[PDB]
Amino acid sequence: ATNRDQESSGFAWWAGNARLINLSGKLLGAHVAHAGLIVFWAGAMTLFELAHFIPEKPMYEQGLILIPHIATLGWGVGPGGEVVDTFPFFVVGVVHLISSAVLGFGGVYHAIRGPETLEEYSSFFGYDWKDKNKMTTILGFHLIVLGIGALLLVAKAMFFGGLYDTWAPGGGDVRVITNPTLDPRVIFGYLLKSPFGGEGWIVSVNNLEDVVGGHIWIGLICIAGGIWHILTTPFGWARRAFIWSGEAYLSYSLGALSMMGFIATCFVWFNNTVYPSEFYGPTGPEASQAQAMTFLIRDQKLGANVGSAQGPTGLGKYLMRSPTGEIIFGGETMRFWDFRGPWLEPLRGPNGLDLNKIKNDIQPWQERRAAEYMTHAPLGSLNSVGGVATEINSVNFVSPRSWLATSHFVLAFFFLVGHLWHAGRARAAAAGFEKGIDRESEPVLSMPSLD
Amino acid sequence: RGWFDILDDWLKRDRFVFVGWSGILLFPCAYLALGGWLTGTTFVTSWYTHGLASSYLEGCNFLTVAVSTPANSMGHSLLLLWGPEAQGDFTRWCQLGGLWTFIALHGAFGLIGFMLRQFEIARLVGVRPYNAIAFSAPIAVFVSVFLIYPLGQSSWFFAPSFGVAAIFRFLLFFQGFHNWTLNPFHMMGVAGVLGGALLCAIHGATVENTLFQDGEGASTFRAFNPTQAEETYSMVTANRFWSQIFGIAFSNKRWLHFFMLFVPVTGLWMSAIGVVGLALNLRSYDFISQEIRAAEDPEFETFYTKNLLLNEGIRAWMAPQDQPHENFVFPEEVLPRGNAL
Amino acid sequence: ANLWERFCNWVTSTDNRLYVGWFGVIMIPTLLAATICFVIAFIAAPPVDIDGIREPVSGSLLYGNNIITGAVVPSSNAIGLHFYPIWEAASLDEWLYNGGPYQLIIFHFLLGASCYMGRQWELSYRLGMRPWICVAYSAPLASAFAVFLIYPIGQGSFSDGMPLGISGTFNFMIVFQAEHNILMHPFHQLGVAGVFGGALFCAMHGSLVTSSLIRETTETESANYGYKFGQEEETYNIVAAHGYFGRLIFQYASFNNSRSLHFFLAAWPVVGVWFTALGISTMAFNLNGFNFNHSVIDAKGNVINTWADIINRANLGMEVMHERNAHNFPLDLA
């Protein structure tokens, strides 16, 4: 029993995983076993979603999150997002699940049977947290694996069936992307956009050409950056700036994953391109714009001149102007005038919504998509009761966008607390006073009085 | 040494659960108030007093079970089992709400016994009875809310019902009818509770981050001995830290821990005084100068006038079912509603 | 030393009365700007059309408000999440009409408070302390982020954020109840358990230490003089307090470790506020509290009401009355 009690290690059982900081062999078995748990859930949940899958119902009415991730990649869907073959969903679930046993075998082996420290076995796999040259090499190796995966998405879009394009003409369909956006003014133009309303930073991407072209740049940068850090050692200005310890490196990734956690939460809640509404349901702004659209169609059929109808406040009951002048829907949805969706763009003109296209160019499929999304707004209770907070028990529905956004926000916040925790201790541990204040060498006792 | 001094020696025996003279009143009263709530929230209904299901037997969960108050027709009756209402019948005693007074009265004498227990144990150990004094704020809240408020109202019906979802109804009732948020005494109570949770978090975190190194392990909890005579954390360093971060800081240990006694106790005491005024419908409901201006000016609007429209909506929608004895019948054309909604 | 060295030595100097630090370099200008704007707006700001329906709400003192009713009105509903600084308006009279000062305040405030949290770590690092004091401060900071930024993001407009006033705060609480049933959310219940238990544990820890102060003063002088600033000896008897509180319940429900006890004093209220901040943040995406409306049914099919249905009647009252003129369609979706 090496470093397995509090006396020999210094860590209680609630901090017992911290006994692996200086045990490379056992620590490797922990990351390989945890990686097996990740692939285990990805395969088991898909088979669970497939066995409970009803093809005639929408995916957002069945509480699916993984099948929509597969359906977005163009596997198993047809025109309009309708499922035509459920076998690709079965393959992804089985192969991920089967691969979990391989990761699990190596995780259990390296953790109880293998060598406790890799410094003895191999000079290539043994490492030191203070080895600045070796740490960047492991960073560069994993950077290349990430760059390859970013290019695997590009190969799927260009050479293996393509992606599902909700903005495809004539309706959503699977489409192969042949001309990815290589222009750096458009790709890197997303990063410099404002994150506030009307811009939205990178969430406002609304076509697959800007998506695939971006993953080409991300793939090439990681490869070029991976080869960089493998051949180089950290410069002096970076050596005097960062804390070089095992706990400090984990604190950097916790702050990085927490930052990425907030990004995915806003990605699924606002963007309907990489998260098509046919799989994840209409967004918050999407369903709100659908209610004004639905009753605009209803009252106009009854003979209401929606262009001249004046609401109780003086604004237009159906249509008004944005602060910059664009013709937008009226009511509380004036906040949601930045919404862009494939079922609404045909009615939009140079100055916004066109009244002539509103009177004569509204199609029945636009009316059905407006009523379906309106009654599937991302509103629900914790026990899965669809509707507003005052709705009676009847509908069993909570939008997957609400399940994905709320979950990854709770995870994003706690991982920020993990940053503030482990990064604060890494500073104190490297300085040498994380265990308390020296009674015979108290620093404050050697300082002048404040007043 | 007689029988009284013999019984006194047995009550004050050093056992796993201390008894004491206060235990003759505490343990049976505290056991009946707890068992009375558990028995009611599992089997006893509220269909004849409120028209509601309030037990696990009828189909409620942990959040909606309750021991509801007696009907409004009962008045401020004690609702004793042998009394004129139940007439010695136990089943009819449950159907009329006799459990609520059974829990409120036996629970009131239990809080008296627990505070007597704090006095008795502190004297035998040889310490000051400050925990007993601090416990006067919880007693002041229970007396003013579960007893003083309904006795000033029409009956026990408008007292809090022993339930999770029933207490949440009690919060929304005081908002729409009393405007309890606008009362300055509840404001002083909010500052005492939130300020108390502030002192609780900021003191424990300051001690843990100003500790001395009395051990070599990473888990610093074993570096403490209850018999030690030295302070376990640097009061000097903690004083300089909060003086440079916040501007002011504590410099006295005894004043700091009494300060933690004063803030939460004073808050609940002030909120109790406001509830006593609510028993007579003496509310901080309105600002007269605001209403005179808004009545003559249809363009004057503040958050004060907007919250009253919510209070007027709360009363009109819940009163027919929340007060069934009144037999309210509100047509659709009299319900205050905004546009569209 | 050159110019930059002596400037860095003064910024990170531990001898300053109010410590600055690099986190304070951003905190000082941001908090001063938000404070100067708030005091001026709370006194002389003209009415603001918060709900974007050309119905301004008076908020400042010079326009007929008191301390309880005065507030800094949020930005217009027509603005939404759009960044609205001063230079984006055609005039200050327009900037004041559409709720300009609100965005200037809550943005400079959230920036300064975040730097205030990092400033708490910075002083702890220069003094040789453990740095997790700011972790406890992350609970009230995340609560401010939830009602000022996270909830407006989920709803698509800063007009739904909590106002900057006493009566305005009450309006934010009531509307949140009707639209989310926050009282029935287990995270707000955890938050109440954190603040109710915190006030309990604050009074409990304070009444036990004071009840065991070793006699150093007499009866004609305050007992606080029994402690001298910077002494080595503990001012109270933890074993005597453990001897009392160990018998009020039972011996083992009482703490004999001062470090483990004070850690519990910091864990319970902070973990409670962490969840209620996540409650407002998760309900910002409309994952609302439990719905048990029409859940109890008799053998025929009649609705047997409960206390959950009574709460629904109160919510309907808040629902149909809030923003009475801002709705033209039957469903309030945001």
Binding site: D451 | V236, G247, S251 | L61, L62, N66, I67, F229
Partner: peptide, 30 residues
């Protein structure tokens, strides 16, 4: 008189912050 009273009471609290911080009684290691 209302606005003047509120601002007067508020200004006295800010002035009290100034004297309580910079003119506090200095704590000394006795």
């Amino acid at each position: 008189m209302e606005t003047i009273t509120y601002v007067f009471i508020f200004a006295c609290i800010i002035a009290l912050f100034f004297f309580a911080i910079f003119f506090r009684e200095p704590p000394r290691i006795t």
